[PDB]
Amino acid sequence: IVGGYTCEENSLPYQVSLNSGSHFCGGSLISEQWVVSAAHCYKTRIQVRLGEHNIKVLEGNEQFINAAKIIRHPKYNRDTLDNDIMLIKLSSPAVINARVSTISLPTTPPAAGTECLISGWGNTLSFGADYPDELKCLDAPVLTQAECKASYPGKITNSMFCVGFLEGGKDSCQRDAGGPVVCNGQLQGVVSWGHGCAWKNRPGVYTKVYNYVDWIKDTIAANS
Ligand SMILES: [Ca+2]
C-alpha cells in the first residue's frame, strides 16, 4: 500500500497473510473455515496467518493454520486476470475473537464514489521498494466504470472494478494482492491488479466479489 497509514493494531481482524516461507499475498476471512483471496496467489501449499499486525514478530494473537483446500475460480484466466478469485478452506476452524473475525459478503455491488478500505503488507513506495512489518491501510473511493475502462482500454472485464485516484499518490502495490477492499462493512473487492503503485492513471483493479457470491456459497457447501 502506497500513500496509506499503519492500521490500528488488529482493527482489521478479517485480514490474513498468506505464507509459503514468507508473506506473499493477502486474503480475507469470510467464515470460521474459509478465506477469500486472488487466484493468481495460488500455491499448492499455503499457511494462513490470522490475527497478525507485525508479520515479523509473534505478538501473541496470531493463529497459524494450514490450507486444507485451495480452489481457484474455474474460469480464472492467468493472462487477463479475468475471474481472479480463490477460496481457501482452513485445516481447522479459526477461533473468533477480537483479533480474528469475519467480514460479511456483499449484498449489492458498490456504487461509484463509495468510500472503501484497502489493506495489506505490500510495497509502500512508488519509487523503489519497502515492504512493511506492520499492516497498512488506505481509504479510497470506488471509481466509475468509465474511468476504470479508460485507464486500461480493452482490459476491464465484467469481473473487475477500480478503486483509487486517477491522479495517483495512493494505491495498492506488489504483495497486497489477494487482500480485502471493504466498503460499508462488506467485502466488495479482492486486490487483483496491484502493480499500479500510485502512478497517475494506473489505479488498482479489484475482483467484484458480489459477482461470485453464488460460487462462493456453492463451493463452501460442496466442500463441507
Ligand atoms: Ca505477528
From Swiss-Prot:
Q: How is its activity regulated?
A: Not inhibited by Kunitz-type trypsin inhibitors.
Top class in the EC scheme: hydrolase
Gene Ontology cellular component terms for the protein in this record: extracellular region; extracellular space; tertiary granule lumen
- GO BP, one annotated term: digestion
pH dependence as annotated: Optimum pH is 8.5.
- Report which superkingdom the organism of origin falls in: Eukaryota
Residue numbers for the site described as Required for specificity? D171
Disulfide-bonded cysteines: C7-C137, C25-C41, C116-C183, C148-C162, C173-C197
What is the free-text note on the cofactor?
Binds 1 Ca(2+) ion per subunit.
Instruction: Supply the alphabetized keyword list.
Output: Calcium, Digestion, Disulfide bond, Hydrolase, Metal-binding, Protease, Secreted, Serine protease, Signal, Sulfation, Zymogen
For molecular function, the Gene Ontology terms on record are: calcium ion binding; serine-type endopeptidase activity; serine-type peptidase activity
Which residues does Ca(2+) bind? E52, N54, V57, E59, E62
What family classification does the UniProt entry report for this protein?
Belongs to the peptidase S1 family.
The protein, known as:
Trypsin-3
Range of the intact protein held here: 81 to 304 of 304
